[PDB]
């Protein structure tokens, strides 16, 4: 606590966009927040960007229009922005500042932390292990999340990256061979659909285990900036804290990246390559590296950013500078959303550099990583199989090619093609792994070791 | 030594009454004490740019001028331990707090002043003896591996005045005293050296002796040098473990350095949790590889500063070592990672990018990192010798080698040790691409080789014509399908696979394949091309007419032959002696020869 | 009908739960009220002046 009285000041030197200069300001601290009294009894927030001596600059929060430079007072906190956390807090749904917006009641603190947090140190991280299932064959069967990585979605813009998201945060949990918590941070998103995350999280009984923060598209850009600092800031508290594994979805990062060009030009700093900062790299790594496991505790967190794709081109610093920091990823296609598969997600392209370590006897079960190897070869070989057939005809095609072709076209129906509705834990997805790979005969099956076909093929 | 903060920026902190200020001098900012360093400066006032998030950070706030400018604290205590790219143990934090976090403003000093070192002068000096720069005066005991030679430091002479006497000092206790033109130092165990300074050698020595690692590929056909520098392809197939755990285990080098840039999270964790389990025998003991081990540790989301200053951090550990008279072995984890911190660095000074938005210093700071390794002949009477070996690796994004810090390192290194990853989907390791790769010290070692072993230099040069020929065939091959196909190019292409499995392939996880010393690798190439001569003459000189000898009655007719060949690699040298197994490779030689023979 | 009734009747049950924890925790804070508000109006009545810390005069 600081128990100092609370300094006012009238005194404003200008207004410039979205920045309030003020003067004779008394020590002020840097990332100070005030807040803002306007002549008609309207309140607003900022924060302070720079001090140069009493030149205190805020930017504020909401819109500047009508703040003068006679009238308008700015109280001062004394301090920093530092989020209330608490175990009750999830359940509940946020604004990007923090503040409630589900009738509740504001958050009850057990404690305050600063958003932008600190490095965990190295030498206390621990590999990761185990396996949280998705519900999502297409990423549980072929490129699974190990309980401590960070995978991000690769969508562009108009698929559904956001029917996905939602589809994880209500079926994802651990595979159960009560600790776990989702927390959910979409930045940048428009009305209709901060509507389905709140309703389809509330209608479906999912909510009790997530923390859910909206930040608007028409929010204010600096709000966006934050919003996954809370939704991590949380998640640290859950995950290493309270002794439980957090999963933390942050949605639509390019909507994150272009707030933060915003906040960069304010600061009149000359854009970087496209555009962006020169930290970019440095302020997603932040973001990014808030998670993992650490010695001496139960706790972890993974993270599933999601990102869209400018232009559809993967060499965007936005997904480049994502990809190059994190391990692996899930990449959602269009081609497939074209054709009505849902979910659309490409096998081929996407990665998971920890699934080596996530699958296998005592995490999920002893044929896991057989069967992703054998029906990864298979689909490729299909899609080879399906490109000849394009150009010499069925009738030109020998019994193993047919085979092939079979699997093809039932893998990508019973496989992949899902719904938004259907759950398919770890153990089911490898079922319907197996009941596709036994329309091979055994002698083809050639990732398999004999003594893994000999117990799981038949039957 | 105080100043003012006046004005924050973000980042960059603006102080006022700060005179007496250098650049690139540290100071500590803030009552949290922020690590930054001075970079602008004007009048009384000086730009600081601060590592850690300023959030907090008054007008007012005292700064803390520290003299020295960014530097490595050297001296005991320094093996075993585990740093940050600006020399903070991280091994200390996590013990000293109990937090799973690094403290912002963290303050832990680089060696612990609570240990009671075991000091042995040297015994040769005496009060009123000369001493220069590079001289010991004596070894600390801090395991059973490496002795910690306590030098003076650099730029520092004068006459002895004060020796302590053998017994147990910590790192803040007064060692030595010296007298210079009436001006009195006292030094203790440690020293401080600038990390952006080279430090002194007497000459710098050209590089002989081999890199002895335990592949056959990267040692028979790409040798490296102790002294020289390579670099290595970073991608996720690409199984640099075995470079890493074969380098830093088995190698002929004192002490191994191990550099994170900047990396994930979860990879710097799998470095730090695989080392600590990593052992060797030495003197019949199984001894722990971070007892002649130091490592340093960054993450992507560490301070830009450090994953930048990483990679000089850890070559001035490697040099202080060096001129200890050890060979030291760095490799730098991704030295794109570094790249990618030293352009950040240069976009938050708002200075013109260059060639694909890297500054244009980029290859000026690569190209004097690398000349800083190769064999030397250290300072000080003791006259000793010593080297520091590069094994950077490069992991560009996309894999191309379009990008300025690939390129320009391979403008640098003298030997490239391309790896693939078809290779290890095939199960093929070590995975090394053979045609990419190269080698630019062949001739620096030809002097050693001559002297040593003779046979070796024909054999690595046959066997690359015998490769090279194998992929020159392929179109052959695929036209042809080894039917209209010379009886001497089946030779070629089938012994060439020969050596593919069982020569340049090698399986570390079995106990007699763990390594494989040199006279045992030559020795197998030895026979192998023995063969391929024999096999080539056996068809060549009856190929005339009437009777002639082909492929097919030379693998039908000495099949076993062929069997022992590949037998070979179980040649266990833990148990089998080199006698031993130099007899039974030359009983293989005479075997093989009188095979042929009686073809003839 | 019988759907709606069930759990409808654990409608009334979530009501029975939920008064029942309001109980709870008005009993709870009950118990050393007097003793939390007490330390509060000790804080606030102490005010311990003090000047800024970087004040340098």
Redesign the interface.
């Known amino acids: 606590y600081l128990?100092?009285p609370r300094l006012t000041y009238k005194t404003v030197s200008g207004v410039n966009g979205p920045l309030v200069i003020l003067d004779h300001v008394?020590?002020?601290?840097?990332?100070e927040i005030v807040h803002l009294t306007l002549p008609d009894g309207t309140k607003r927030s900022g924060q302070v960007?720079?001090?140069?001596?009493?030149?205190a600059v805020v930017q504020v929060f909401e819109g500047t229009s009508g703040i003068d430079a006679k009238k308008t007072s700015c109280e001062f906190t004394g301090?920093?922005l530092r989020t209330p956390v608490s175990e009750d807090m999830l359940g509940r749904v946020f604004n990007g500042s923090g503040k409630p917006i589900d009738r509740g009641p504001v958050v009850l603190a057990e404690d305050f932390l600063?958003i932008?947090?600190?490095?965990?140190?190295?030498?206390?991280?621990?590999?990761?292990e185990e396996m949280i299932q998705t519900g999502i064959s297409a990423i549980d069967g072929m490129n699974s999340i190990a309980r401590?990585?960070?995978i991000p979605i690769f969508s562009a813009a108009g698929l559904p990256h956001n029917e996905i998201a939602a589809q994880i945060c209500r079926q994802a949990g651990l595979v159960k061979k009560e600790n776990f918590a989702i927390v959910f941070a979409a930045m940048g998103v428009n009305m209709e659909t901060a509507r389905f995350f709140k309703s389809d999280f509330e209608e479906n009984g999912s909510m009790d285990n997530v923390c859910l923060f909206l930040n608007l598209a028409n929010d204010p850009t600096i709000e966006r900036i934050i919003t996954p600092r809370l939704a991590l800031t949380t998640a640290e508290f859950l995950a290493?804290q309270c002794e439980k594994h957090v999963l933390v979805i942050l949605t639509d990062m390019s909507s994150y990246a272009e707030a933060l060009r915003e906040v960069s030009a304010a600061?009149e700093?000359?854009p970087?390559?496209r555009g962006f900062?020169?930290?970019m790299?440095?302020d997603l790594?932040?973001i990014?590296?808030?998670?993992?496991r650490?010695?001496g505790?139960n706790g972890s967190i993974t993270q599933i950013p999601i990102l869209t794709m400018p232009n559809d081109d993967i060499?965007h610093p936005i997904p480049?500078l994502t990809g190059?920091?994190?391990?692996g990823q899930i990449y959602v296609d269009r081609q497939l959303h074209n054709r009505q598969i849902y979910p659309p997600i490409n096998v081929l392209p996407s990665?998971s550099?920890?699934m080596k370590s996530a699958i296998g006897e005592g995490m999920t079960r002893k044929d896991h990583a057989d069967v992703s190897n054998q029906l990864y070869a298979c689909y490729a070989i299909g899609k080879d199989v399906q490109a000849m057939k394009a150009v010499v005809g069925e009738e030109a095609l020998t019994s193993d090619d047919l085979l092939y072709l079979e699997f093809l076209q039932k893998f990508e129906k019973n496989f992949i093609t899902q719904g938004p509705y259907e759950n398919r834990t770890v153990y089911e997805t490898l079922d319907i792994g197996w009941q596709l790979l036994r329309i091979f005969p055994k002698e083809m099956l050639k990732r398999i070791p004999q003594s893994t076909l000999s117990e799981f093929y038949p039957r | 030594t105080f100043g003012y903060v006046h004005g924050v920026s973000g980042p960059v902190v603006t102080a006022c009454d700060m005179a007496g200020a250098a650049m690139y001098e540290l100071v500590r900012v803030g009552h949290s004490e922020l690590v930054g360093e001075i970079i602008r400066l004007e009048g009384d006032m000086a730009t600081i740019q601060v590592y850690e998030e300023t959030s907090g950070v008054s007008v007012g706030d005292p700064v803390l001028r520290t003299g020295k400018p960014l530097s490595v604290e050297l001296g005991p205590g320094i093996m075993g331990a585990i740093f940050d790219g600006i020399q903070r143990p991280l091994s200390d934090i996590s013990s000293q707090t109990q937090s799973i976090y690094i403290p912002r403003g963290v303050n832990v000093s680089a060696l612990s002043r609570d240990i009671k070192w075991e000091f042995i002068p040297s015994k040769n000096l005496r009060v009123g003896s000369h001493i220069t720069g590079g001289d010991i005066y004596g070894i600390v005991n801090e395991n059973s591996l490496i002795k910690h030679k306590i030098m003076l430091p650099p730029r520092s002479r004068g006459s002895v005045t004060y020796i302590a006497p053998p017994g147990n000092y910590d790192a803040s206790d007064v060692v030595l005293e010296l007298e210079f033109e009436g001006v009195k130092e006292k030094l203790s165990m440690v020293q401080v050296w600038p990390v952006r300074q080279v430090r002194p050698v007497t000459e710098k020595l050209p590089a002989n002796h081999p890199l002895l690692t335990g592949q056959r590929v990267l040692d028979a056909l790409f040798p490296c040098v102790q002294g020289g520098t390579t670099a290595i392809p970073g991608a996720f197939g690409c199984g640099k473990t075995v470079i890493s755990q074969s380098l830093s285990k088995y190698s002929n080098s004192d002490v191994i350095i191990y550099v994170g840039c900047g990396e994930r999270g979860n990879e710097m964790s799998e470095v730090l949790r695989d080392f600590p389990e990593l052992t060797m025998e030495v003197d019949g003991k199984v001894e722990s590889i971070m007892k002649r081990t130091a490592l340093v540790a960054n993450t992507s989301n560490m301070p830009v500063a450090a994953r930048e200053a990483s990679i000089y951090t850890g070559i001035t550990l490697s040099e202080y070592f060096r001129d200890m008279g050890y060979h030291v072995s760095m490799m730098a984890d991704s030295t794109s990672r570094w790249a990618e911190a030293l352009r950040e660095i240069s976009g938050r000074l708002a200075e013109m990018p260059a060639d694909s938005g890297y500054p244009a210093y980029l290859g000026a700071r690569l190209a004097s990192f690398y000349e800083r390794a190769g064999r030397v002949k250290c300072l000080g009477n003791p006259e000793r010798e010593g080297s520091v070996s590069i094994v950077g690796a490069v992991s560009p994004p996309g894999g191309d080698f379009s990008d300025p810090v690939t390129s320009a390192t391979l403008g640098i290194v003298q030997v490239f040790w391309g790896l693939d990853k078809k290779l290890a989907q095939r199960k093929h390791f070590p995975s090394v691409n053979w045609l990419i790769s190269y080698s630019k010290y062949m001739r620096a070692l030809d002097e050693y080789y001559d002297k040593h072993f003779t046979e070796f230099v024909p054999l690595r040069t046959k066997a690359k014509e015998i490769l090279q020929e194998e992929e020159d065939l392929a179109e052959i091959v695929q036209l042809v399908g080894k039917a209209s196909l010379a009886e001497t190019d089946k030779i070629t292409l089938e012994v060439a696979k020969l050596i593919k499995d069982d020569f340049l392939q090698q399986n570390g996880y079995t106990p007699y394949d763990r390594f494989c010393p040199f006279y045992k690798t030559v020795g197998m190439l030895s026979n192998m091309i023995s063969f391929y001569d024999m096999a080539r003459r056996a068809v060549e000189t009856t190929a005339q007419s009437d009777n002639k000898i082909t492929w097919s009655i030379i693998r039908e007719h000495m099949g076993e032959i062929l069997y022992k060949l590949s037998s070979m690699k179980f040649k266990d040298p833990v148990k089998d002696g080199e006698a031993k197994i130099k007899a039974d490779y030359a009983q293989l030689l005479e075997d093989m020869q009188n095979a042929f023979r009686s073809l003839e | 009908q019988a759907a709606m009734g069930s759990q409808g009747n654990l409608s009334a049950e979530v009501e029975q739960a939920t008064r029942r924890q309001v109980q709870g925790m008005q009993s709870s804070q009950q118990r050393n009220r007097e003793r939390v508000l007490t330390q509060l109006l000790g804080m606030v009545c102490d005010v311990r002046p003090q000047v800024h810390p970087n004040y340098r005069i």
């Open positions: 128990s100092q008394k020590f002020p601290r840097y990332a960007l720079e001090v140069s001596g009493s030149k301090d920093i600063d932008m947090g600190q490095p965990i140190n190295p030498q206390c991280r621990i590999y990761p401590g990585q960070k290493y600061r700093e000359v970087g390559r900062p020169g930290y790299y440095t790594a932040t990014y590296e808030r998670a993992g650490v010695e505790r060499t480049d190059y920091i994190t391990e990665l550099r920890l």
